[PDB]
Design an enzyme around this catalytic site. Structure first.
Site, short mmCIF file in Angstrom:
data_model
loop_
_atom_site.label_atom_id
_atom_site.label_comp_id
_atom_site.label_asym_id
_atom_site.label_seq_id
_atom_site.Cartn_x
_atom_site.Cartn_y
_atom_site.Cartn_z
CD1 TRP A 49 -1.70 -2.44 1.07
CD2 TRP A 49 -3.31 -0.83 1.31
NE1 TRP A 49 -2.95 -3.01 1.05
CE2 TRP A 49 -4.07 -2.01 1.25
CE3 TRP A 49 -4.04 0.39 1.66
CZ2 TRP A 49 -5.31 -2.12 1.35
CZ3 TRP A 49 -5.31 0.21 1.66
CH2 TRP A 49 -6.03 -1.02 1.72
CG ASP A 51 -0.03 3.91 4.28
OD1 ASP A 51 1.01 3.65 3.74
OD2 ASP A 51 -0.22 3.65 5.62
CE1 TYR A 86 -7.53 4.11 2.03
CE2 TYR A 86 -5.61 3.87 3.36
CZ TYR A 86 -6.90 4.11 3.16
OH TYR A 86 -8.10 4.05 4.47
NE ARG A 91 -6.65 7.16 3.86
CZ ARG A 91 -5.16 6.87 4.59
NH1 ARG A 91 -4.25 7.10 3.76
NH2 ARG A 91 -4.98 6.35 5.77
CG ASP A 92 -10.02 6.29 5.11
OD1 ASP A 92 -10.16 5.55 4.50
OD2 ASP A 92 -8.73 6.70 5.59
CB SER A 98 -9.21 9.80 8.04
OG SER A 98 -8.52 8.91 7.06
CG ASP A 138 -13.13 3.73 3.65
OD1 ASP A 138 -14.32 3.35 3.48
OD2 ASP A 138 -12.59 3.93 4.46
CG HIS A 183 -17.79 -5.54 1.56
ND1 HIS A 183 -19.06 -6.43 2.41
CD2 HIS A 183 -17.60 -4.81 2.73
CE1 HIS A 183 -19.23 -5.47 3.55
NE2 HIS A 183 -18.31 -4.49 3.77
CD1 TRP A 186 -21.31 0.15 1.63
CD2 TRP A 186 -19.34 -0.18 1.75
NE1 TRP A 186 -20.74 1.43 2.13
CE2 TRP A 186 -19.33 1.23 1.90
CE3 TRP A 186 -17.83 -0.57 1.86
CZ2 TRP A 186 -18.41 2.12 2.22
CZ3 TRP A 186 -16.79 0.45 2.18
CH2 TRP A 186 -17.24 1.77 2.31
CG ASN A 222 -15.42 -6.62 4.91
OD1 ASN A 222 -16.19 -7.60 5.45
ND2 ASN A 222 -15.76 -5.64 5.65
CD1 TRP A 283 -16.45 -0.79 9.99
CD2 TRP A 283 -14.08 -0.80 10.10
NE1 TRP A 283 -16.05 0.42 10.54
CE2 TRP A 283 -14.60 0.27 10.43
CE3 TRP A 283 -12.82 -1.11 9.90
CZ2 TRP A 283 -13.77 1.41 11.03
CZ3 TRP A 283 -11.96 0.08 10.53
CH2 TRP A 283 -12.55 1.13 10.99
CE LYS A 311 -5.49 -4.25 6.97
NZ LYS A 311 -5.07 -2.93 7.58
CD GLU A 315 0.65 -4.14 6.71
OE1 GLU A 315 -0.21 -3.42 5.91
OE2 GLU A 315 1.56 -4.52 6.26
CG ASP A 317 -8.77 -3.87 9.98
OD1 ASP A 317 -7.96 -3.86 9.16
OD2 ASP A 317 -9.48 -4.84 10.70
C1 LIG Z 1 -23.27 -0.47 4.66
O1 LIG Z 1 -22.23 -1.49 4.97
C2 LIG Z 1 -21.30 -1.23 5.67
O2 LIG Z 1 -20.87 0.28 5.47
C3 LIG Z 1 -19.74 0.70 6.18
C4 LIG Z 1 -19.29 2.11 6.07
O3 LIG Z 1 -20.90 2.90 6.33
C5 LIG Z 1 -18.56 -0.20 5.87
O4 LIG Z 1 -17.60 0.11 6.63
C6 LIG Z 1 -16.22 0.50 6.14
O5 LIG Z 1 -15.59 -0.61 5.62
C7 LIG Z 1 -14.38 -0.91 5.34
C8 LIG Z 1 -13.74 -2.23 5.29
O6 LIG Z 1 -14.63 -2.92 4.13
C9 LIG Z 1 -13.34 0.12 6.10
S1 LIG Z 1 -11.88 0.02 5.20
C10 LIG Z 1 -10.47 0.47 6.40
O7 LIG Z 1 -9.54 1.35 6.23
C11 LIG Z 1 -8.48 1.11 5.37
C12 LIG Z 1 -8.95 0.87 4.01
O8 LIG Z 1 -9.18 -0.56 3.85
C13 LIG Z 1 -7.27 -0.16 6.17
O9 LIG Z 1 -6.52 0.60 6.95
C14 LIG Z 1 -5.04 0.62 6.22
O10 LIG Z 1 -4.69 -0.52 5.61
C15 LIG Z 1 -3.67 -0.47 4.88
C16 LIG Z 1 -2.95 -1.72 4.59
O11 LIG Z 1 -2.88 -2.35 6.05
C17 LIG Z 1 -2.40 0.59 5.62
O12 LIG Z 1 -1.31 0.79 4.70
C18 LIG Z 1 -2.94 1.80 5.98
O13 LIG Z 1 -2.09 2.47 6.85
C19 LIG Z 1 -4.34 1.66 6.84
O14 LIG Z 1 -4.87 2.97 7.11
C20 LIG Z 1 -8.31 -0.81 7.09
O15 LIG Z 1 -7.77 -2.01 7.42
C21 LIG Z 1 -9.81 -1.01 6.85
O16 LIG Z 1 -10.32 -1.83 7.87
C22 LIG Z 1 -13.90 1.49 6.64
O17 LIG Z 1 -12.82 1.84 7.51
C23 LIG Z 1 -15.34 1.35 7.06
O18 LIG Z 1 -15.70 2.56 7.34
C24 LIG Z 1 -18.81 -1.67 6.14
O19 LIG Z 1 -17.62 -2.46 5.59
C25 LIG Z 1 -19.99 -1.93 5.25
O20 LIG Z 1 -20.36 -3.51 5.66
#
Ligand SMILES: CO[C@@H]1O[C@H](CO)[C@@H](O[C@@H]2O[C@H](CO)[C@@H](S[C@@H]3O[C@H](CO)[C@@H](O[C@@H]4O[C@H](CO)[C@@H](O)[C@H](O)[C@H]4O)[C@H](O)[C@H]3O)[C@H](O)[C@H]2O)[C@H](O)[C@H]1O
Ligand SMILES: *[C@@H]1O[C@H](CO)[C@@H](O)[C@H](O)[C@H]1NC(C)=O
Ligand code: NA
Ligand code: NA
Length: 362
Positions: A49, A51, A86, A91-92, A98, A138, A183, A186, A222, A283, A311, A315, A317
């Site tokens: 990533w 990131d 990313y 972001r996010d 974020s 995301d 996914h 979602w 996910n 998540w 992912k 590492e 979340d």
């Molecule tokens: C309605 O269904 C649900 O909707 C919600 C949102 O309203 C969904 O929630 C979102 O789900 C996402 C997972 O599916 C996560 S992604 C999250 O952040 C990042 C991006 O994937 C990841 O963090 C990073 O990972 C990198 C690799 O390890 C690093 O390089 C970087 O430094 C990190 O920031 C993290 O692992 C993920 O978990 C959203 O946060 C969440 O809001 C839900 O899935 C639906 O079901």
């Protein structure tokens, strides 16, 4: 463009993850069985990533350099790179705070364009390394379901613009791009799937249907199954309760609107099903999960170029420390493993959970 970018190449297992396993995890794991397994997981090729801006001129170049080197030394078949872009500003958008470093209100668009431009420069210099990209996990998915959230509403136009910018600037001949598309749990819900197809298909169109845009990546970060015989309890009442169902429903809607998207599906933490999630939207650092099927282009499915590990398991979340600035509610729940460090940082207990629950095992 006809050609699966995963076909006929080996996938490079990067040294950033390998070092994580060898320096942070293996020395910490006393049990022989697990430590053999750990070393084996380090060789499973997961996405690297970008990131943070600082990764562009360091890690990206390092990895492409190492791949070129391995290939020049006779790797057969040649190695390909898997990289995630990313770093959108704001972001996010659905999170309170974020880990993203840029902001739309503070020159975020210009910072991101330079980011993309520099990545492009580098990719053009490594035109001998087939490079597969996942664009902005995301991000656009939030536009389908989170427009009631002010930061998301406010970020939508910028997300779209910068996504198009990326698709066009990184449309190089040795590149394949997959946009993140959430996914099954979602965007896969019947009330969301059509609006999602609209969104993504329209982006493809406005971007000029660049050759390099192969399609969409699902289940990134996910836990969903690719295909299970009965629906996990937390999926009801969604008929699209695994990625296979999702994609089979999704593709026709995308296609009818001009985007015949091929898919890659994250399975890096999908090995154990059902998971230990109490609700599907849980998540963060979910308990009861395991490493899943190993990356391969041999998916057996016409619409799926490859099962991948996007992912990198182990590492984090997000942090569970309520005293912490980027604390997120979902990371503090009963079904989130605790205590957890900052997002992206090594979470060794979670690594061990994934190892124990690996399917197929290591
Ligand atoms: C309605 O269904 C649900 O909707 C919600 C949102 O309203 C969904 O929630 C979102 O789900 C996402 C997972 O599916 C996560 S992604 C999250 O952040 C990042 C991006 O994937 C990841 O963090 C990073 O990972 C990198 C690799 O390890 C690093 O390089 C970087 O430094 C990190 O920031 C993290 O692992 C993920 O978990 C959203 O946060 C969440 O809001 C839900 O899935 C639906 O079901
Ligand atoms: C992003 O990194 C590049 C080096 O690749 C640096 O020149 C640039 O200033 C960085 N961006 C910001 C806004 O600091
Ligand atoms: Na080297
Ligand atoms: Na719509």
């Amino acid at each position: 463009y006809a050609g699966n970018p995963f076909e006929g190449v080996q996938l490079w297992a990067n040294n950033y993850y390998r070092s994580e396993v060898h320096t942070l995890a293996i020395p910490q794991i006393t049990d022989p069985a697990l430590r053999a397994a750990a070393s084996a997981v380090a060789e499973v090729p997961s996405f690297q990533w970008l990131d943070r801006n600082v990764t562009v001129d360091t890690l990206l170049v390092q990895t492409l350099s190492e791949i070129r080197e391995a290939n020049q030394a006779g790797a057969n078949p040649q190695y390909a790179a898997q990289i995630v872009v990313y770093d959108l500003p704001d972001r996010d958008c659905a999170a309170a705070a974020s880990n993203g470093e840029w902001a739309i209100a503070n020159n975020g668009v210009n910072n991101y364009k330079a980011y993309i431009n520099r990545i492009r420069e580098i990719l053009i210099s490594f035109s001998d390394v087939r490079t597969i990209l996942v664009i902005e996990p995301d991000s656009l998915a939030n536009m389908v379901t989170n427009m009631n959230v002010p930061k998301c509403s406010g970020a939508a136009s910028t997300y779209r613009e910068l996504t198009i910018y990326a698709l066009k600037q990184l449309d190089l001949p040795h590149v394949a791009m997959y946009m993140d598309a959430g996914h099954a749990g979602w965007l896969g819900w019947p009330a969301n799937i059509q609006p999602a197809a609209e969104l993504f298909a329209k982006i493809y169109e406005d971007a000029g249907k660049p050759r390099a845009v192969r399609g969409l990546a699902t289940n990134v970060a996910n836990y969903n199954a690719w295909s299970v015989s009965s629906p996990p309890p937390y999926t009801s009442p969604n008929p699209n309760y695994d990625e296979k169902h999702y994609i089979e429903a999704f593709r026709p809607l995308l296609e009818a609107r001009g985007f015949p998207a091929q898919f890659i599906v994250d399975q890096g933490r999908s090995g154990k099903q059902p998971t230990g999630q109490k609700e599907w939207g849980h998540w963060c650092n979910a308990i009861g999960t395991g490493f899943g099927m190993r990356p391969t282009a041999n998916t057996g499915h016409q619409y799926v170029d490859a099962f991948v590990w996007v992912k990198p398991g182990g590492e984090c979340d997000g942090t569970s420390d309520t005293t912490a600035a980027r604390y997120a509610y979902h990371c503090g729940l009963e079904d989130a493993l605790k205590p957890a460090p900052e997002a992206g940082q090594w979470f060794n207990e979670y690594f061990i959970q994934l190892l124990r629950n690996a399917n197929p095992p290591f």
